[PDB]
Amino acid sequence: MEVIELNKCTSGQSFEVILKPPDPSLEEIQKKLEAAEERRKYQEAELLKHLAE
Amino acid sequence: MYTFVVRDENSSVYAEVSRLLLATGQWKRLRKDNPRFNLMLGERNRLPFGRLGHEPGLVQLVNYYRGADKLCRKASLVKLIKTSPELSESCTWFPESYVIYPGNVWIAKSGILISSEAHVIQKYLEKPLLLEPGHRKFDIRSWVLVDHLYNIYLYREGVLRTSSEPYNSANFQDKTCHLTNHCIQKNYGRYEEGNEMFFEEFNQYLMDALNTTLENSILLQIKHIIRSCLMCIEPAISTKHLHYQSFQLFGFDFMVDEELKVWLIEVNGAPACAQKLYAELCQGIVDVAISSVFPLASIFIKLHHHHHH
Amino acid sequence: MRECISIHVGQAGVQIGNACWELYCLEHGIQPDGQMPSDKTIGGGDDSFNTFFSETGAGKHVPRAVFVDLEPTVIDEVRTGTYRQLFHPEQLITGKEDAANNYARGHYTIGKEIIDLVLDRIRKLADQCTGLQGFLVFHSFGGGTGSGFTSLLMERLSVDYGKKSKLEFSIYPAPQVSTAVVEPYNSILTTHTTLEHSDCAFMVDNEAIYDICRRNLDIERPTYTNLNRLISQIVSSITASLRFDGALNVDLTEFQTNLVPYPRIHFPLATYAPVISAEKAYHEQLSVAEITNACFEPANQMVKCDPRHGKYMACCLLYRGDVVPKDVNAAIATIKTKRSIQFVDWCPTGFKVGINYQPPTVVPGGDLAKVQRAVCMLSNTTAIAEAWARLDHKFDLMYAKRAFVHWYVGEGMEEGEFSEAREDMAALEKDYEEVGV
Amino acid sequence: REIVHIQAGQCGNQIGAKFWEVISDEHGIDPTGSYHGDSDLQLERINVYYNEAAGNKYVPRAILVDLEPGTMDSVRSGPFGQIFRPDNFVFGQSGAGNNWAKGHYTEGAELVDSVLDVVRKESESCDCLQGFQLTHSLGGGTGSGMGTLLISKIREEYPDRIMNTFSVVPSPKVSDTVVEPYNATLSVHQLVENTDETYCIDNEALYDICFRTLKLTTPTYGDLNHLVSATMSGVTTCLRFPGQLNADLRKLAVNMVPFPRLHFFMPGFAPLTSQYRALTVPELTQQMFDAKNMMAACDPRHGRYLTVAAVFRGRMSMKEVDEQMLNVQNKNSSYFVEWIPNNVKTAVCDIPPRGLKMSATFIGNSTAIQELFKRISEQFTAMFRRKAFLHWYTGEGMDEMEFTEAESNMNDLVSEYQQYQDA
Ligand SMILES: Nc1nc2c(ncn2[C@@H]2O[C@H](COP(=O)(O)OP(=O)(O)OP(=O)(O)O)[C@@H](O)[C@H]2O)c(=O)[nH]1
Ligand SMILES: Nc1ncnc2c1ncn2[C@@H]1O[C@H](COP(=O)(O)OP(=O)(O)CP(=O)(O)O)[C@@H](O)[C@H]1O
Ligand SMILES: Nc1nc2c(ncn2[C@@H]2O[C@H](COP(=O)(O)OP(=O)(O)O)[C@@H](O)[C@H]2O)c(=O)[nH]1
Ligand SMILES: [Ca+2]
Ligand SMILES: [Ca+2]
Ligand SMILES: [Cl-]
Ligand SMILES: [Mg+2]
Ligand SMILES: [Mg+2]
């Protein structure tokens, strides 16, 4: 059981014990968000057309 | 009402457990995908153990131990025996066996080949105990139930699945005398009904022919083997302190050689039962595995040993 | 010294944030007014605690934190509560109307209108950093803001700070305290959209915390306050290496290096011991061996699952209190001979161990007893995929009928996003299977 | 945050007034609009239903509408009648003669604009309006016809706000005219398209409760309205007091409505009253799920629950509440659809209603609600196949085709509820 990289300081210690070896761009984000907003606008206009009928 | 779901339609054992529970009055069967069950009688393949024990207000129980497959496949069993120090490469009750990927008689299996030349390759037991009359091979099936507390219960009735052909050293091509499976035999039925001899008869035979008992000559060794196998995998499969609990029925198959030494052949994780013993064993499953967890409003020998050293 | 900015999103993220900063103040000797008498460098410094706190010329120690919610009532409690003087008003951001438990309403409809303001406020914190390492992001999977706004933010943070690490603390939904039927939807949609933007994510299943509070703290019906005080201890254990002197997990990058060799498989399991009730009048104190052994018990995990039936890719043990390496190594030797600890073939079988000598601090009048030693284990185990399976199944049941889908479509999301998200989760479950089985 | 309340017609204004009486007492608001309560929980979400005027006066955000003055003169003389804003009383003189067409197309249309002016003035000063609740009946002319006209006009001007109704469904057992089924079928058609959530308050059920359970041999409108007001108090508790679950109208919709048209809820209440014995948590729970406690005359065992909200009020063990809610789901699992997991949500509020230590309110989205629509549909057809009483409607300019379309749409709603029950 090998103990490696022992480091000690006043607040503690660390070490390792081995038992065995072996994106979208700003533009794209903006397009997606405006497309969603366009779909909401479209649904809203369809509702108001139906209500005008 | 307690509630249960059935997810393997082909289990003979669990169709009868299901039918018993319903006739109690105090169990309701639910559609197979309703998650609000106390008890899963699970499928054999890819049972969703990760979805169990996440139901507020239901104590949940399943009829399989996750990880028990290690004991119940041929390649897995060989590896577990060789590599577990409690069993070891020098284990006396398992035949010398080798995992193989794609008196010198060996058997190849995982659809079986017996020869002295050249999956698991296993030393074929050349000197079996042979029943008289008929000079014939058999294997012993023992049924074992492990409950949620990891008690190990040996059903007191086993069965000998016999050959009805004389045993033949100089023909391993012809398999009806070398392989004791129920299907492979179906002179069938001649000596006993369905090539099944039960313990009362076999014990009588061991007394009359060999001046000993079934308990002394064979069953001590059977109990030792079952206990050693199951205690070995316990840390890996126990559901003690887990958020769901498991039980499971196992079918251990044994060979007895002519010096009355018992060898392990097989552990079956989804066994069937001999016709004659369904009713009793399935009632035992309800009493020991289910009502113990889900109480309503002994046919087993409990295997336990604490030798001090 | 290199700074870390904490971002708390939605109710869960905000309330957990409150509990964490309260605890950090107690650990570092910072008072509710922000004064820290032990800090002898007035108005600046590059001490380890400065990773999380900046300093004004008047001696105020100010969390490097932004709180964001789409309705105001939770953040108003921070504005009026005990630690109100700790935070500048511009760090606390609220809208007027929430995401109504709808990912699409957090991500698209409302997120589009507050996102520039939130990035502006984050930028203000970043401009005060001389070597910003990155971000810690706290949120629920289940809420509309915690799911939908967080995924939008994470995307934008990759664009605006592309070199920087992003870690998450994520609350996985449990029906015993959940407030919406559609939480499985929101969880899959956020996990899908966030997966490439997060380097390391610590999932906390509310069911596990809930049960620990009932079983070990004797709380009959845990509230968020009970759950969050426990969660804040686990968070503190994880971040202690960034805030105190030490040689392990000292920067955000090291979390990924030590815990995530496969980038999509970036969900370490946290297990914490011991959790002991403050009302328990006779407590026998637990040894290094006992607390370490408790790390391999499912009942102490932050997600209930069974690591015996998966494989380890990494394990870190983070100790606090009276612990020396010799006892750690003897405890580990015992555990190896008793337990099913199987690593994948391409990683060494091993533990990275950090010890901080100060015992855990507790919040006075809290539920947790003060103990002489504690440990947090962080293990990257394939068994955590059991949680993905449970969530994915629930998603499938509802989605096969399109139940509630119209609420998401009415916010301008396309139905296709559902099955794209679900297929990314199917590939994730598959990755975990290929590594683990 | 703010809800705008509208009450239309005789029924709407009678149940509406009782609602304001009951909730003003729960929030400690007296008839002058002064707060004289004992607890900060009473005032913390007071703005949801009340505006604050000068002198720390609380004024209901309430608009009172009718085509005749009679019931609104009675509102103004009622116990809380002085609390309403005077400008929020909008009344015509004509009446609507139990005629949906008069409410919707002729008499109501003449008045609807002045109602919208008041809606807009209340809406304009809302910090963040969540939406609208309307109280009305479906069997008369003003609440039914003019109420659904209002809903349509309100949607056109506030299309992104939530619309909620308490809608009283007619019954021959408590019946004013033969034309009720016509007026209700025409109204349901509107509700299916233009509300997000509708509490089906069935006069059949209220009557059966008063008669069978409460032993009132001759139930009045007052006895029926006692049940309605307790239910309304119960189902709005989560909107009115601090809490986690269903705390606004949109979150309730998202939890309760899996498909947009299936938004008709079966309310229930326990214990049933018109008494000193303490009610246990197990007993509240069994009784709140009991057919006999439901305010829509539908057998919930004849269908399945898509979603349920349960609200418990009073000092009680939350552990025991959780256990019992789990117990009813586990023992009756087949009545909850398996393809919406965890579809029952529970809230507990510490403040009980007046005169009870403990109570429970039930809100069910059950496919059994189809029974209510089928009953109305059969009464509609029995007349409509002979065109009986139609001249009341064709005299206001309506064609038969409009009756055929409304009937067809309500038969479609029934088939949809049946589809999810078999799934
Ligand atoms: N552990 C914990 N979980 C919480 C807390 N608050 C909410 N949750 C959980 O988070 C989920 C609900 O999400 P919230 O964070 O409340 O929602 P939100 O992000 O505010 O989103 P909207 O309110 O929909 O805008 C559920 O699974 C809750 O159980 C908390 O303080 N602690
Ligand atoms: N090493 C060995 N020596 C002698 N006989 C052997 C043997 N291995 C297997 N056999 C014989 O072959 C028969 C069937 O072999 P095996 O146990 O592999 O099949 P199986 O998997 O069908 C048993 P089960 O149906 O109970 O699972 C055994 O009953 C036994 O008689
Ligand atoms: N529950 C209840 N139902 C009422 C009340 N008043 C009338 N109704 C019912 O309402 C319907 C008649 O409508 P009403 O509201 O009188 O007509 P409107 O003024 O034109 O809307 C019938 O179905 C009556 O049974 C009441 O106070 N309570
Ligand atoms: Ca300093
Ligand atoms: Ca006129
Ligand atoms: Cl950068
Ligand atoms: Mg919120
Ligand atoms: Mg009338």
Author numbering:
A (entry chain E): 6 to 27, 44 to 74
B (entry chain F): 1 to 102, 144 to 151, 159 to 166, 180 to 247, 252 to 362, 373 to 384
C (entry chain A): 1 to 437
D (entry chain B): 2 to 275, 280 to 428
Manuscript excerpt for this entry:
The α, β-tubulin heterodimer reversibly assembles into protofilaments of microtubules. This protein complex, denoted T2R-TTL, has been used in previous structural studies of tubulin-modifying agents.
We determined the structure of an apo (no ligand soaked) T2R-TTL complex crystal to 2.2-Å resolution to provide structure grown under identical conditions for comparison with the pironetin complex we obtained. The apo T2R-TTL complex is essentially identical to that previously described, briefly two α, β-tubulin dimers are arranged as head to tail (denoted α1β1–α2β2; subunits A, B, C and D, respectively) with the long α-helix of the stathmin-like peptide (subunit E) contacting both tubulin dimers. TTL (subunit F) docks onto α1-tubulin (subunit A). The two α-tubulin subunits (A and C) clearly have GTP bound. In β2-tubulin (subunit D) of both structures, the density is better fitted with GTP than GDP. In β1-tubulin (subunit B) of both structures, the density is more consistent with GDP but not unambiguously so.
